[PDB]
Write an enzyme that holds these catalytic residues in place. Structure first.
Site, PDB file in Angstrom:
ATOM      1  N   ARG A   1       0.846  -1.173   0.000  1.00  0.00           N
ATOM      2  CA  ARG A   1       0.000   0.000   0.000  1.00  0.00           C
ATOM      3  C   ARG A   1       0.899   1.248   0.000  1.00  0.00           C
ATOM      4  O   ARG A   1       1.143   1.844  -1.068  1.00  0.00           O
ATOM      5  CB  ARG A   1      -0.967  -0.047   1.191  1.00  0.00           C
ATOM      6  N   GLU A   2       1.404   1.643   1.173  1.00  0.00           N
ATOM      7  CA  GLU A   2       2.366   2.742   1.256  1.00  0.00           C
ATOM      8  C   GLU A   2       3.496   2.559   0.219  1.00  0.00           C
ATOM      9  O   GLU A   2       3.864   3.518  -0.476  1.00  0.00           O
ATOM     10  CB  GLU A   2       2.947   2.847   2.663  1.00  0.00           C
TER      11      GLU A   2
ATOM     12  N   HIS B   1      -7.306  -0.607   2.779  1.00  0.00           N
ATOM     13  CA  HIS B   1      -7.354   0.802   3.052  1.00  0.00           C
ATOM     14  C   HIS B   1      -8.666   1.366   2.516  1.00  0.00           C
ATOM     15  O   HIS B   1      -9.256   0.809   1.566  1.00  0.00           O
ATOM     16  CB  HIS B   1      -6.152   1.453   2.361  1.00  0.00           C
TER      17      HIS B   1
ATOM     18  N   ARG C   1      -9.856  -0.272  11.744  1.00  0.00           N
ATOM     19  CA  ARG C   1      -8.862   0.678  12.214  1.00  0.00           C
ATOM     20  C   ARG C   1      -9.199   2.064  11.692  1.00  0.00           C
ATOM     21  O   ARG C   1      -9.681   2.205  10.579  1.00  0.00           O
ATOM     22  CB  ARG C   1      -7.458   0.250  11.769  1.00  0.00           C
TER      23      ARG C   1
ATOM     24  N   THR D   1       2.722  11.643   9.297  1.00  0.00           N
ATOM     25  CA  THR D   1       2.606  11.812   7.852  1.00  0.00           C
ATOM     26  C   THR D   1       3.798  12.508   7.206  1.00  0.00           C
ATOM     27  O   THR D   1       4.211  12.112   6.107  1.00  0.00           O
ATOM     28  CB  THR D   1       1.305  12.588   7.572  1.00  0.00           C
TER      29      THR D   1
ATOM     30  N   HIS E   1       2.804   4.896  12.348  1.00  0.00           N
ATOM     31  CA  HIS E   1       3.071   4.981  10.922  1.00  0.00           C
ATOM     32  C   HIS E   1       3.985   6.176  10.751  1.00  0.00           C
ATOM     33  O   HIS E   1       3.559   7.314  10.887  1.00  0.00           O
ATOM     34  CB  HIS E   1       1.759   5.150  10.146  1.00  0.00           C
TER      35      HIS E   1
ATOM     36  N   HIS F   1       6.956   8.293   8.741  1.00  0.00           N
ATOM     37  CA  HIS F   1       7.737   8.712   7.617  1.00  0.00           C
ATOM     38  C   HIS F   1       9.115   9.197   7.989  1.00  0.00           C
ATOM     39  O   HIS F   1       9.362   9.664   9.123  1.00  0.00           O
ATOM     40  CB  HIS F   1       6.995   9.790   6.836  1.00  0.00           C
TER      41      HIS F   1
ATOM     42  N   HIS G   1      40.591  -1.714  11.544  1.00  0.00           N
ATOM     43  CA  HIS G   1      39.345  -2.468  11.763  1.00  0.00           C
ATOM     44  C   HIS G   1      39.475  -3.943  11.395  1.00  0.00           C
ATOM     45  O   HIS G   1      39.053  -4.824  12.147  1.00  0.00           O
ATOM     46  CB  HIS G   1      38.237  -1.864  10.911  1.00  0.00           C
TER      47      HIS G   1
HETATM   48  C1  LIG Z   1      -8.737   7.629  -4.236  1.00  0.00           C
HETATM   49  C2  LIG Z   1      -8.726   8.266  -5.634  1.00  0.00           C
HETATM   50  C3  LIG Z   1      -9.175   7.214  -6.656  1.00  0.00           C
HETATM   51  C4  LIG Z   1      -9.690   9.455  -5.700  1.00  0.00           C
HETATM   52  O1  LIG Z   1      -9.620  10.038  -7.011  1.00  0.00           O
HETATM   53  P1  LIG Z   1     -10.526  11.298  -7.382  1.00  0.00           P
HETATM   54  O2  LIG Z   1     -11.916  10.868  -7.004  1.00  0.00           O
HETATM   55  O3  LIG Z   1     -10.188  11.746  -8.780  1.00  0.00           O
HETATM   56  O4  LIG Z   1     -10.105  12.424  -6.354  1.00  0.00           O
HETATM   57  P2  LIG Z   1      -8.696  13.200  -6.255  1.00  0.00           P
HETATM   58  O5  LIG Z   1      -7.516  12.309  -6.131  1.00  0.00           O
HETATM   59  O6  LIG Z   1      -8.657  14.397  -7.168  1.00  0.00           O
HETATM   60  O7  LIG Z   1      -8.658  13.498  -4.677  1.00  0.00           O
HETATM   61  C5  LIG Z   1      -9.385  14.337  -3.882  1.00  0.00           C
HETATM   62  C6  LIG Z   1     -10.714  13.790  -3.379  1.00  0.00           C
HETATM   63  O8  LIG Z   1     -10.769  12.850  -2.277  1.00  0.00           O
HETATM   64  C7  LIG Z   1     -11.240  13.532  -1.095  1.00  0.00           C
HETATM   65  N1  LIG Z   1     -10.595  12.913   0.072  1.00  0.00           N
HETATM   66  C8  LIG Z   1      -9.283  12.851   0.331  1.00  0.00           C
HETATM   67  N2  LIG Z   1      -9.062  12.096   1.447  1.00  0.00           N
HETATM   68  C9  LIG Z   1     -10.257  11.671   1.899  1.00  0.00           C
HETATM   69  C10 LIG Z   1     -10.733  10.859   3.037  1.00  0.00           C
HETATM   70  N3  LIG Z   1      -9.834  10.362   3.908  1.00  0.00           N
HETATM   71  N4  LIG Z   1     -12.058  10.628   3.166  1.00  0.00           N
HETATM   72  C11 LIG Z   1     -12.940  11.150   2.269  1.00  0.00           C
HETATM   73  N5  LIG Z   1     -12.561  11.905   1.195  1.00  0.00           N
HETATM   74  C12 LIG Z   1     -11.265  12.203   0.979  1.00  0.00           C
HETATM   75  C13 LIG Z   1     -10.911  14.978  -1.345  1.00  0.00           C
HETATM   76  O9  LIG Z   1     -11.655  15.872  -0.538  1.00  0.00           O
HETATM   77  C14 LIG Z   1     -11.294  15.057  -2.805  1.00  0.00           C
HETATM   78  O10 LIG Z   1     -12.685  15.009  -3.034  1.00  0.00           O
HETATM   79  P3  LIG Z   1     -13.316  15.900  -4.207  1.00  0.00           P
HETATM   80  O11 LIG Z   1     -13.127  15.024  -5.428  1.00  0.00           O
HETATM   81  O12 LIG Z   1     -14.706  16.041  -3.706  1.00  0.00           O
HETATM   82  O13 LIG Z   1     -12.526  17.166  -4.246  1.00  0.00           O
HETATM   83  C15 LIG Z   1      -7.342   8.791  -6.027  1.00  0.00           C
HETATM   84  O14 LIG Z   1      -6.955   9.957  -5.288  1.00  0.00           O
HETATM   85  C16 LIG Z   1      -6.298   7.741  -5.830  1.00  0.00           C
HETATM   86  O15 LIG Z   1      -6.293   6.779  -6.562  1.00  0.00           O
HETATM   87  N6  LIG Z   1      -5.445   7.953  -4.824  1.00  0.00           N
HETATM   88  C17 LIG Z   1      -4.360   7.056  -4.473  1.00  0.00           C
HETATM   89  C18 LIG Z   1      -4.543   6.529  -3.042  1.00  0.00           C
HETATM   90  C19 LIG Z   1      -4.376   7.667  -2.055  1.00  0.00           C
HETATM   91  O16 LIG Z   1      -4.481   8.841  -2.441  1.00  0.00           O
HETATM   92  N7  LIG Z   1      -4.136   7.328  -0.780  1.00  0.00           N
HETATM   93  C20 LIG Z   1      -4.054   8.361   0.251  1.00  0.00           C
HETATM   94  C21 LIG Z   1      -3.490   7.890   1.580  1.00  0.00           C
HETATM   95  S1  LIG Z   1      -3.725   9.285   2.724  1.00  0.00           S
HETATM   96  O1  LIG Z   2      -2.934   4.239   7.386  1.00  0.00           O
HETATM   97  C1  LIG Z   2      -1.923   4.714   7.993  1.00  0.00           C
HETATM   98  O2  LIG Z   2      -1.601   4.394   9.176  1.00  0.00           O
HETATM   99  C2  LIG Z   2      -1.032   5.745   7.312  1.00  0.00           C
HETATM  100  C3  LIG Z   2      -1.689   6.644   6.261  1.00  0.00           C
HETATM  101  C4  LIG Z   2      -0.562   7.436   5.604  1.00  0.00           C
HETATM  102  O3  LIG Z   2       0.021   6.982   4.609  1.00  0.00           O
HETATM  103  C5  LIG Z   2      -0.141   8.724   6.193  1.00  0.00           C
HETATM  104  O4  LIG Z   2      -0.983   9.562   6.590  1.00  0.00           O
HETATM  105  O5  LIG Z   2       1.075   8.973   6.284  1.00  0.00           O
HETATM  106 ZN   LIG Z   3       2.180   7.262   4.922  1.00  0.00          ZN
END
Ligand SMILES: CC(C)(COP(=O)(O)OP(=O)(O)OC[C@H]1O[C@@H](n2cnc3c(N)ncnc32)[C@H](O)[C@@H]1OP(=O)(O)O)[C@@H](O)C(=O)NCCC(=O)NCCS
Ligand SMILES: O=C(O)CCC(=O)C(=O)O
Ligand SMILES: [Zn+2]
Ligand SMILES: CC(C)(COP(=O)(O)OP(=O)(O)OC[C@H]1O[C@@H](n2cnc3c(N)ncnc32)[C@H](O)[C@@H]1OP(=O)(O)O)[C@@H](O)C(=O)NCCC(=O)NCCS
Ligand SMILES: O=C(O)CCC(=O)C(=O)O
Ligand SMILES: [Zn+2]
Lengths: 399, 398
Positions: A30-31, A94, A154, A188, A216, A218, A310
């Site tokens: 994932r990460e 996740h 979680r 983070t 978690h 970084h 050494h």
């Molecule tokens: C998840 C994913 C498919 C969403 O794609 P998308 O719908 O095009 O949206 P964007 O990436 O532009 O991201 C922002 C959106 O998610 C929202 N968002 C971000 N984190 C969120 C959370 N924890 N809970 C709810 N919404 C969240 C933002 O507010 C935003 O919403 P909006 O579209 O209404 O503005 C895409 O961001 C992705 O594939 N991300 C990779 C995984 C990731 O980002 N992991 C984060 C770990 S913190």
């Molecule tokens: O799920 C977690 O504990 C970490 C999420 C993450 O990648 C972060 O906020 O740094």
């Molecule tokens: Zn992280």
């Protein structure tokens, strides 16, 4: 032996040298796949998950299934292998705090769903466009919703380490009441200071004895390993890792280093230490990012000595320059020869090659080695040629 | 339930308010009889031991039998009461590292013998006239001898807190190998600093997981209470106390304060907190040494307020000036009236007395109270006389 539940410990072992619990959650899948330039195929994902299961990782975070179809499919395959006993770790999926993600997580039958939300003021404002109170409601609803599918939940408090601490406590009460049994505290941006990390987790564990906590961490300021050990001192029962320090930007705490530091400082074996090199090498192959030779524990140079002083010490007692024996990690020591060498090292290598040189001949070879400033190493063929230059004779080792 | 075994705890409770254990050893009958001018009769010893048992002390150190015939007899009677089940605490007898003290301790059938020896450099040289190595041999033999009698043995490291720490570790290894199951770390002259005490016990408990440690802390620098809580933080499972701060020179950690401090900071009740005043009073009676009125927990003034501002607050919410409710310790609050008083306090006392005065009349009484610099207390008779002097009416059953 390399089982898939918590490891008992008692914190740091005594200076000059079991009521607590700790285990590994590995997030390579994932990460780790959030590393620039790194993607895994479904088959690669599955192969890594099996390796993580085999070395005794407690939890595998297999991905965020809404991200792409291939990630969904890889997670599904892993859960299937778990159901069949091929994989033994707990499988974590996740999820955003959005119904869709949660339903997907539920439908693939993950052991645990990790819902994340950003609870610092910059995240609430800039990322989520929400208020403290509104965030509390969204989190409560989504955690409850996930719970009601009959899966463990979680909650990850993203940017917890820069959040208002009073608010963090409110967040934790909220998610606890809504049914989460674990909370991950996410550093983070890697800004935790280790002594402060210990305090943070001591306080949180003392306040919420019905919840278990993850760290978690970084590595932005180079302190991920120290922070995870400090968290464990404070009572964190799960440490998040990736192989090789993969992750966003500079990555998170690296599994091989964390595992070694826990062995040395806490006296425990949270994964099969002797298999770290093999798993690191696997991830290196699929990630396409080479480990530098100075990477701790698994790096090319971790048990390679150079300076004459050494090598001479090591030849008498390796413990002089070795924190633990290389065999601890299934490795063997080595030494290199260049202008930094000395007579004991040069003698030892000739002995290995079966070449008998006099003490004065050794002096002459050493002088020749030291006469050239810009040679990066002397291979055995180079050393044999140097000896020939001193003996006038044509000069047995099997490598 | 104020039982006679260890109490479970988790260290300090969280800021803004179970794997560890702790219990009380009370040494009122040993350390406490070493207070200048304090001696107990055999009867008084027995009666104190019964009260210690009744409030739930884990261990009673009933004395050092070799010191005198009456001490021997008191301990023998205490042990008889233990056998009969009247007393329930573990009964500990003190002993020098000398075969006779040990035989005598064995012979009275004490539950535990506690052998002490001074292990600091000054103690070895000036008091034992011995060497570090010789001390080790003496300690090994005597502990072994005591253990061969089939009795549990504690070793007390006297002046441990000024001893060479490496030597202390050797001492502990030595007594452990000789058969001691407990070691008392004695801050004989009260020089432990609390944060360093926590570190000491943390270190010792991690190095000797098969030994349990006691803290014996003197009050020479006023920190015996802070030291014993710090020791408990670090893993000590037995805290030595006496009632009322009895003991040599300035005494050791006082039971009533330790017990309260553990309740507040660790959330535990290691003796019956409501019986502390009664036992303190008993020991006060037999020791012949009065507690000062300012003694914590059991002192006359621990729950007595004086300043007008405090009494006004307490009358609205007693928590304003009370760390815990007085009933915690089976006590009641009160306040006094002198020039430091105010209108809410004076009005309240008149209410208690059944005297109804106007606000104007209260102001006049208050002004008269404040006009006498050297009146220590306005007793109720005085207040009634003041009220009579303002109302011209009859007001004045104590
Ligand atoms: C998840 C994913 C498919 C969403 O794609 P998308 O719908 O095009 O949206 P964007 O990436 O532009 O991201 C922002 C959106 O998610 C929202 N968002 C971000 N984190 C969120 C959370 N924890 N809970 C709810 N919404 C969240 C933002 O507010 C935003 O919403 P909006 O579209 O209404 O503005 C895409 O961001 C992705 O594939 N991300 C990779 C995984 C990731 O980002 N992991 C984060 C770990 S913190
Ligand atoms: O799920 C977690 O504990 C970490 C999420 C993450 O990648 C972060 O906020 O740094
Ligand atoms: Zn992280
Ligand atoms: C115990 C007792 C009756 C000894 O009386 P005593 O034989 O006349 O001896 P003193 O008290 O003058 O001196 C103490 C002697 O014991 C020795 N001694 C002191 N501590 C000792 C120990 N832990 N183990 C063995 N011997 C010890 C001293 O070296 C000295 O020996 P010496 O007679 O060869 O010089 C007597 O000191 C007494 O009643 N003391 C009260 C109890 C007490 O002192 N408790 C201390 C707890 S730390
Ligand atoms: O026996 C003990 O624990 C204490 C001995 C003693 O009197 C002291 O050194 O203060
Ligand atoms: Zn003492």
């Amino acid at each position: 032996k390399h089982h898939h539940h918590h490891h008992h410990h008692g914190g740091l072992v005594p200076r000059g040298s079991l009521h607590m619990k700790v285990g590994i959650l590995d997030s390579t899948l994932r990460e780790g796949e959030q590393t620039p330039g790194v993607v895994f195929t479904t088959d690669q994902r599955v192969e890594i998950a099996k390796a993580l299961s085999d070395i005794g990782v407690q939890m595998i975070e297999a991905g965020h299934p809404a991200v792409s179809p291939d990630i969904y499919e890889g997670i599904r395959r892993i859960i299937k292998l778990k159901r069949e006993g091929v994989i033994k770790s707990e499988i974590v999926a996740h999820s955003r705090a959005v119904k869709r993600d949660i339903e997907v997580g539920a439908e693939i039958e993950a052991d645990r769903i990790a819902i994340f939300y950003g609870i610092s003021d910059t995240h609430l404002k800039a990322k989520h466009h929400t208020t403290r109170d509104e965030a509390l409601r969204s989190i409560a609803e989504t955690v409850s919703y996930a719970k009601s599918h009959g899966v463990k939940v979680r909650f990850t408090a993203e940017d917890a380490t820069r959040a208002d601490y009073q608010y963090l406590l409110e967040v934790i009460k909220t998610v606890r009441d809504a049914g989460a049994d674990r909370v991950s505290i996410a550093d983070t941006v890697g800004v935790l200071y280790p002594s402060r990390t210990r305090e943070l987790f001591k306080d949180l564990t003392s306040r919420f004895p019905d919840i278990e906590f993850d760290i978690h961490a970084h590595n932005d300021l180079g302190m991920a390993v120290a922070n995870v050990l400090a968290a464990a001192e404070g009572g964190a029962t799960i440490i998040h890792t990736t192989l090789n320090g993969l992750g966003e930007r500079v990555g998170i705490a690296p599994l091989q280093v964390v595992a070694a530091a826990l062995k040395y400082h806490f006296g425990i074996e949270v994964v099969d230490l002797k298999k770290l090199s093999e798993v690191a090498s696997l991830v290196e192959k699929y990630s396409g990012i080479a480990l530098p030779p100075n990477f701790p524990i698994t790096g090319d140079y971790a048990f390679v000595h150079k300076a004459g002083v050494h090598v001479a010490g090591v030849l008498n007692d390796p413990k002089t320059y070795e924190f633990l024996p290389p065999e601890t990690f299934g490795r063997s020591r080595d030494y290199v020869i260049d202008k930094y060498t000395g007579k004991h090292a040069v003698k030892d290598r000739f002995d290995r090659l079966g070449v008998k040189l006099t003490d004065s001949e050794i002096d002459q070879v050493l002088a020749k080695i030291k006469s050239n400033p810009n040679v990066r190493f002397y291979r055995d063929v180079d050393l044999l040629e140097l000896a020939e230059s001193v003996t006038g004779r044509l000069e047995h080792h099997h490598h």
